[PDB]
Write a protein that binds this ligand. Structure first.
Ligand SMILES: Nc1ncnc2c1ncn2[C@@H]1O[C@H](COP(=O)(O)OP(=O)(O)O)[C@@H](O)[C@H]1O
Ligand SMILES: Nc1ncnc2c1ncn2[C@@H]1O[C@H](COP(=O)(O)OP(=O)(O)O)[C@@H](O)[C@H]1O
Ligand SMILES: [Mg+2]
Ligand SMILES: [Mg+2]
Lengths: 371, 157, 157, 371
């Protein structure tokens, strides 16, 4: 019986069928609502638009970003994202498919309980499950122990994991990710005299970033190479057919990940946050975390990112220590891929929380059954 | 099962209301208080300045009020929408799940007290025909510093 | 009604125990986890270093452990006594009422996470044959500063 | 049917019978326990000592102060204070008497719920009630509107009240009270060469404070009067029969209430905290709070305190404003006196929460029934 996997991302929702090589539906986790200002109490809630439809109608609608920082802050908005995922994106009846949900790191016990409630009560699902994001990414690399660096759209997490159980004291949140890099690329492209301002122009900047932006092994070596010759410079074609030539912007944009001072952030770099996190962990596990560094999500897709990570971690960690950065090409959807493999296993049908089980224990059953 | 809205002494007894969108408390005095109990899927509006409001064991409740002298207390409830049109000094959200505090352009100094609660959002109005939503933290971090426990707010920003 | 203590895969199934003071988990490995569920008025002691511990829906529970790699999580429980003899990085107290975290002279850096909880006390040991008690805050104050919500801890000191 | 009134103080528990002119039992809210350090999990909880018995055995016992700051932080300790109040101090069966409990300002909804639980479940009471401390003090002055300045043993509160409902945003906590003044009196008596250090010597300092200490109308006028002549100096007889002569210590000790900088506190004075609190309140109620200032608890028993309060408030408030400080001589037990009058009224038997009511609603019934 075809089970659904739903990764509720800070920027994008990834949904599809467990067993499939990649998510069938990938859309913005944005809910758009008509603008209201009077007596704000809902009689019988009118019209709403989700995803690309919401995002395009940006000007005329109040947009709600419920997963903005990884954790769901609004359930009516989340129910709209889920109802759009089921009926409109995946075009399936939730009542017929057991459903797996991804959860953010440092997610409240009440948050996982409400996920269960909505699934059973609001979507009439036959079964469901709550799995942690970083864990699913590690599970994709076959590993159950490692420090996952998950860089998505709105948030970046360092999540140390020992035997499939996250070490919450060492989880590091960095509120610098995909949307920030796209924003900086826009800021530094104004320098060359290129002006990207419309919601439609941002799409081009996101495209440039994803296509031409690389992580320099040595930033200063590259800044001098970019200053001496036009060797590193590259051309990009715009929708209208004009060609723009971008230079040092190529490596200065994902350098914000390592040097947050570029966007005015007091925060330490992704290399620093990784090291710091492994240092917070017990001396008895540090070796395994050093040797099993797993990269995940869109903002890790940059070329040269893993090479730099090796170089910066080798620098902070003791001389003797072995470091292995793992960047699977699937890493853009590795959370979803993990959950896909998990819901697929024949030795997982026991693991689901059934509505018969929910009818008895209620939403509190998530702590026991999803351990 | 039972159902009543009435002024008992000085307090408004809005009790056991089930699916009523047009509920208004029109006559009002500073002296008077309001106690909304066991209301399921109902909308209520208090017009005028009153002493205080309490919402106990209410499911999917919606309360709009003008002005308050004391406090508005949301207790042992779920899915509650609360709004000020005027001024309110404090909004307390206690053992409630899902609470949306729509403030007013005067109630911007309003203190939102929280305890044993979740899905709390403070809605701040803009001059753009809507409100900007902001979540309230719900997880905390205490440390032993060497002399005293130090508790810090686990941010969502 | 049912009652069992057993190693299922990698996790300790301490479930449905009712009035047992002498309960010890002697054989242990870093890899293994513990899930104490529906235990009423029982005392348990985990000897050795393990991955993590969870306490779900337990009434008047008492847990003593040596060392932990990950976290100890107390969930939907009441009147729980938790103690470290060694090291523990985090203690999470979630939707529980009455929780006494007796720390150890190494676990002094232990982070006590709290959410929807009450009657929480962090017990810090002294060289005087006892522990000094310190309450954990349980009420919070959020403000609109003009750009963001500012939440401050309502102290008990 | 004889109803009990129990004021659970930060320093002292005041208990007795509703209708009686004063509390029958007045003892320290201290629980003493034998010293333990091993496996700290209770099998079948051994021996405990409450009150004066605990306090005297200070050296050999670990003492627990559960009401230290007004709010109860430990329920096993509180159950021991209550069980000692019932059976040992008041010598009554809780099962036969409906019981009223006083509650601190800014008390958690869970705290009032647990009070109800313990009363019904742990003491088998026929009925009970939870009333706020400051409210009961105001109710004693016949008033239902005013700003109560409650200065007890461990905590000082400013509690504005409108029509018997406290304004929580304007409640001011000052963790400076009775025990602090006694401590300072000990510190400044060392100056004259008098050494009070034993738990037994502290009792003498508490006695001096309560007997010879007054609040100066103008501190500097008195400090110059004390410097010029020995007119303000007074003699005190110690248990052994020796006579000590105390000077300026008489007014310097309760001056810490107005000038906290005397004990190293950054906090503003009791006059400042009062004004500030009335200012936090709505413009529509400020007049009533100015004209109805009610003093309560032991640390307000000082002579000259009300005169000074008038003088300092007249100074901060507008010139036009009427200020009336109210200091009833009963103020040391006015919370208890209030609850006594309340549980006494024949039009209060409706107000109690009965065990029949508790059997249905549980501890959540306190919010409805105690509103
Ligand atoms: N090839 C790529 N190179 C660099 N960044 C990318 C690439 N593909 C996606 N991203 C960026 O990463 C983000 C999407 O990452 P994702 O892991 O899906 O986020 P989330 O789960 O937080 O919603 C977007 O900001 C996107 O522009
Ligand atoms: N006559 C008095 N003059 C000054 N202070 C007094 C007097 N009587 C009691 N006190 C002091 O006030 C405190 C007792 O006040 P109380 O209101 O009972 O406190 P609480 O309710 O916080 O337990 C003690 O520190 C005591 O020494
Ligand atoms: Mg993600
Ligand atoms: Mg008192």
């Amino acid at each position: 019986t075809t089970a659904l996997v739903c990764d509720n991302g800070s920027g994008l929702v990834k949904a599809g069928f467990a067993g499939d090589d990649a998510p069938r539906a990938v859309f913005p986790s944005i809910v758009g609502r008509p603008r209201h200002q009077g007596v704000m109490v809902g009689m019988g809630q009118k019209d709403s638009y989700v995803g690309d439809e919401a995002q395009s109608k940006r000007g005329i609608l109040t947009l709600k970003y419920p997963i903005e920082h990884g954790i769901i802050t609004n359930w009516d908005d989340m129910e709209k994202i889920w109802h759009h995922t089921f009926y409109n994106e995946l075009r399936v009846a939730p009542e017929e498919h057991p459903t797996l949900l991804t959860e953010a790191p440092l997610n409240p016990k009440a948050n996982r309980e409400k996920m269960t409630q909505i699934m059973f009560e609001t979507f009439n699902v036959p079964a469901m499950y709550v799995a942690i994001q970083a864990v699913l990414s590690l599970y994709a690399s076959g590993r159950t122990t490692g420090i996952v660096l998950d860089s998505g759209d709105g948030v970046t997490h360092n999540v140390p994991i020992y035997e499939g159980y996250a070490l919450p004291h060492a989880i590091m949140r960095l509120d610098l990710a995909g949307r920030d890099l796209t924003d900086y690329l826009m800021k530094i492209l104004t320098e060359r005299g290129y002006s990207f301002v419309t919601t439609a122009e941002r799409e081009i900047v996101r495209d440039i970033k994803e296509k031409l932006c690389y992580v320099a092994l040595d930033f200063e070596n590259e800044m001098a190479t970019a200053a001496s010759s036009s060797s590193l410079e590259k051309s990009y074609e715009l929708p209208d057919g004009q060609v723009i030539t971008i230079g040092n912007e190529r490596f200065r944009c994902p350098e914000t990940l390592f040097q947050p001072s570029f966007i005015g952030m007091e925060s330490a770099g992704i290399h620093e946050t990784t090291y710091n996190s492994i240092m917070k962990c017990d001396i008895d596990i540090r070796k395994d975390l050093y040797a099993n560094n797993v990269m995940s999500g869109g903002t890790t897709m940059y070329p040269g990112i893993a090479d730099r990570m090796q170089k910066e971690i080798t620098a902070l960690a003791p001389s003797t220590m072995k470091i292995k950065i793992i960047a699977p090409p699937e890493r853009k959807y590795s959370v979803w891929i993990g959950g896909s493999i998990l819901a697929s296993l024949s030795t997982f049908q026991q693991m689901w929380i059934t509505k018969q089980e929910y009818d008895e224990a209620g939403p509190s059953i998530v702590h026991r059954k999803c351990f | 099962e039972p159902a009543l809205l009435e002024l008992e002494g000085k307090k408004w007894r809005v009790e056991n209301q089930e699916n009523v969108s047009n509920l208004v408390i029109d006559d009002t005095e500073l002296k008077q208080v309001a106690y909304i109990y066991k209301c399921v899927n109902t909308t209520l509006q208090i017009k005028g300045k009153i002493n205080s409001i309490t919402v106990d064991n209410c499911k999917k409740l919606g309360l709009v009020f003008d002005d308050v002298v004391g406090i508005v207390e949301i207790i042992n409830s779920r899915d509650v929408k609360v709004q000020v049109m005027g001024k309110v000094p404090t909004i307390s959200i206690n053992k409630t799940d899902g609470c949306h505090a729509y403030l007013s352009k005067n109630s911007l100094d309003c203190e939102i007290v929280s305890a044993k609660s979740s899905e709390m959002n403070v809605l701040i109005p803009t001059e753009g025909g809507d409100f900007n939503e902001f979540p309230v933290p719900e997880q905390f971090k205490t440390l032993w510093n060497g002399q005293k426990l130090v508790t810090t707010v686990t941010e969502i920003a």
